[PDB]
Ligand binder design. Structure first.
Ligand SMILES: Cc1cc2nc3c(=O)[nH]c(=O)nc-3n(C[C@H](O)[C@H](O)[C@H](O)COP(=O)(O)OP(=O)(O)OC[C@H]3O[C@@H](n4cnc5c(N)ncnc54)[C@H](O)[C@@H]3O)c2cc1C
Ligand SMILES: Cc1cc2nc3c(=O)[nH]c(=O)nc-3n(C[C@H](O)[C@H](O)[C@H](O)COP(=O)(O)OP(=O)(O)OC[C@H]3O[C@@H](n4cnc5c(N)ncnc54)[C@H](O)[C@@H]3O)c2cc1C
Ligand SMILES: Cc1cc2nc3c(=O)[nH]c(=O)nc-3n(C[C@H](O)[C@H](O)[C@H](O)COP(=O)(O)OP(=O)(O)OC[C@H]3O[C@@H](n4cnc5c(N)ncnc54)[C@H](O)[C@@H]3O)c2cc1C
Ligand SMILES: Cc1cc2nc3c(=O)[nH]c(=O)nc-3n(C[C@H](O)[C@H](O)[C@H](O)COP(=O)(O)OP(=O)(O)OC[C@H]3O[C@@H](n4cnc5c(N)ncnc54)[C@H](O)[C@@H]3O)c2cc1C
Lengths: 315, 313
């Protein structure tokens, strides 16, 4: 009944587990809520993170850091965050527990760390397994992450909107051999079609029917209109769904598009809510998310420490 | 002939920057002197993905190999000076310890990632300190506070500002004894505050750390004082490895730290600063992320000034 957590970490991914590790090692009472199978879970090769081999899967990191978090004293709840509500001095966090016959317990806490990230939109094919066979292997979702591994390859840019097609003029740094596929989504305007033609990047607007290859290595793409092309890699640039629905009930949050605006310690405009990694305005990388968790946990500790009574040595 | 970026220091922040720079297709040089602060870290306690007993030296070997794998160049040397040539910077490196040469490299950008090194109490034989420093004698409260919880500890602090750490360390344990190691006499006001909190104060120089297998058991002072303690925190300041910036104009400082923006960029346009050199928390995670942001800003600068790569048909 009375039990109030010092902080509840929403999402047990890269940024969340870092925050959880620090929170527990600051002697604070914290809870991690993880639904499972998040974005980092679909990462097959973490390419650019100090200390880890460049073929480490995200799932192995999640397993490692979850055990570490528990080892230091964090609590873990496997469930789905539904809503966060403001009770003034504390926040209330409702969690869906159980996929079938679910229970919706409510937890109270001094602080919330929003670390639930995003999930990339994928092209909808008749059988999504054809996409999963390559997505995260040779079909990439993050240019910073895998650009080097695409160098001078024949690539496809899968982009739904005119703003998403503009990535071709950054991706060309890594390879000029870009073919744009709209997957039959928004029609391309004349001004953009002329720019692509001026750069030499072919454009195909027919819906994609199948990705060709074997052993997770792309070899080509086929469209509904019979078009067939050769390509050994690609970039998905179709936007993302943001895992921030539980914040509907919170007032006073400041946004930059779909991203939360945070200060240097990853604090939102709401004094008791922090936001990490892919949810916040800034670069979307593992290293950046882990550091956000470090700073958020440290700011929370500083708040709680400075409001507590000094621990004196009684003689 | 001209590097896209030169990374000064091949530690936590520098090797991250080098990894990203190389994977951005940029020509970058890492200058590493060897045996830095992270080299003396025995257990990285709080870093996502790594076991909490991982030594810093093992990380350096791993990430240096990765940096080289992606195409970064490595020079084993000592950065001596950085000069501003306008469109580029010149970086002089001492190569060779006994018979040295001073080659000069030019670059569009410099990443200052040479960190700091903690001051240690000077004993007759420094090995007595090294036996415990980084094991049970800590230099970073955030790093090892949890591992000190409710233990009898010593705070080794030279100045009144350094003694003030006792009023943050008390969060982890109230059983703090302050040792000034005979460096600065403590004022009456601070003596009264320590007494009110119950933290004993000893001002005599330390002679020996007691214990076995890197596990502290006590401390002995020159005046014969002996005490029991299983851990401690060194708070005697640090030497900053930023001497090579003496000639540069337009840099902003906060104390000994360089002031940087969100992409770890210093007030000078072509100089970035990472990790322990910059104002902010001193952690591995923070340093690694700084290297990510610096490398990404440099790439954006160079990319946006380059000509688009077109597909010729
Ligand atoms: C590069 C990449 C590769 C991918 N590869 C694959 C793949 O190979 N196979 C695959 O399946 N997917 C893959 N995905 C993910 C896929 O695209 C979909 O996003 C995913 O299948 C959605 O899962 P879901 O429908 O369960 O949605 P979720 O949002 O995970 O769940 C939907 C609902 O389930 C309930 N729920 C979820 N978790 C819990 C819980 N712990 N407790 C209680 N209730 C819960 C909630 O009501 C929730 O709203 C990949 C994604 C990417 C970006
Ligand atoms: C294929 C692929 C490869 C990549 N490669 C790299 C790389 O090489 N280098 C790099 O820096 N970055 C890479 N990234 C991106 C990187 O994974 C993200 O930037 C990083 O994971 C962000 O961390 P985060 O903690 O913000 O989000 P995540 O790590 O995704 O963590 C969020 C967690 O929250 C959980 N969650 C979501 N909603 C709810 C809810 N309602 N309730 C409870 N839990 C919830 C999710 O299941 C997930 O586990 C890659 C991404 C992909 C898809
Ligand atoms: C917690 C902790 C534990 C420690 N434990 C130990 C220990 O167990 N053993 C130990 O020895 N030290 C240890 N140290 C480090 C110690 O305190 C001193 O900082 C160290 O001995 C200084 O080395 P140095 O005199 O070579 O100084 P440096 O600054 O490393 O070198 C001094 C000079 O050498 C030249 N030089 C250095 N490197 C190069 C190069 N690659 N090429 C050309 N010239 C170069 C330059 O002119 C430079 O100015 C520890 C430090 C800490 C914080
Ligand atoms: C004993 C100990 C335990 C620690 N434990 C933790 C922990 O558990 N968690 C945590 O987050 N942090 C810990 N830290 C702190 C952590 O090591 C630093 O925050 C981190 O190393 C900062 O990275 P950096 O790249 O800024 O500095 P460094 O990692 O020190 O990198 C700087 C590099 O520059 C080189 N260099 C210096 N001067 C020159 C020059 N003139 N020319 C060429 N090269 C030069 C150095 O040799 C070094 O390799 C610990 C520190 C110590 C001493």
């Amino acid at each position: 009944l009375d039990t109030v957590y010092d902080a509840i970490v929403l999402g047990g991914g890269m940024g969340g587990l870092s925050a959880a590790i620090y929170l527990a090692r600051y002697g604070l009472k914290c809870l991690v809520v993880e639904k499972g199978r998040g974005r980092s879970f679909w990462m097959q090769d973490l390419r650019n993170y100090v200390g880890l081999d460049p073929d480490t899967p995200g799932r192995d990191i999640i397993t490692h850091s979850t055990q570490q978090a528990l080892h230091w004293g964090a609590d873990l709840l496997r469930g789905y965050v539904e809503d966060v509500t403001d009770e003034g001095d504390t926040l209330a966090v409702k969690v869906k527990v159980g996929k079938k016959d679910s229970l919706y317990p409510i937890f109270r806490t001094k602080y919330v760390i929003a670390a639930t990230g995003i999930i990339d939109n994928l092209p909808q094919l008749e059988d999504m397994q054809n996409v999963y066979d390559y997505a995260g292997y040779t079909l990439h979702v993050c240019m910073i992450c895998d650009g080097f591994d695409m160098w001078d390859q024949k690539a496809v840019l899968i982009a739904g909107t005119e703003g998403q097609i503009n990535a071709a003029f950054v991706l060309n740094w890594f390879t000029p051999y870009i073919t744009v596929l709209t997957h039959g989504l928004c029609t391309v305007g004349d001004e953009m079609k002329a720019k692509l033609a001026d750069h030499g990047y072919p454009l195909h607007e027919a819906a994609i029917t199948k990705f060709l290859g074997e052993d997770h290595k792309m070899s080509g793409v086929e469209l509904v209109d019979g078009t067939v092309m050769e390509a050994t890699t690609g970039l998905i640039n179709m936007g993302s769904v943001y895992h921030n629905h539980y914040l509907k009930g919170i007032e006073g949050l400041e946004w930059d598009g779909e991203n939360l605006v945070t200060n240097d310690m990853a604090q939102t405009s709401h004094p008791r809510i922090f936001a990490l990694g892919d949810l916040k305005k800034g670069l979307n990388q593992v290293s950046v998310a882990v550091a956000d968790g470090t700073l958020a946990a440290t700011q929370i500790w500083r708040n709680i420490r400075r409001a507590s009574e000094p621990r004196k040595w009684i003689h």
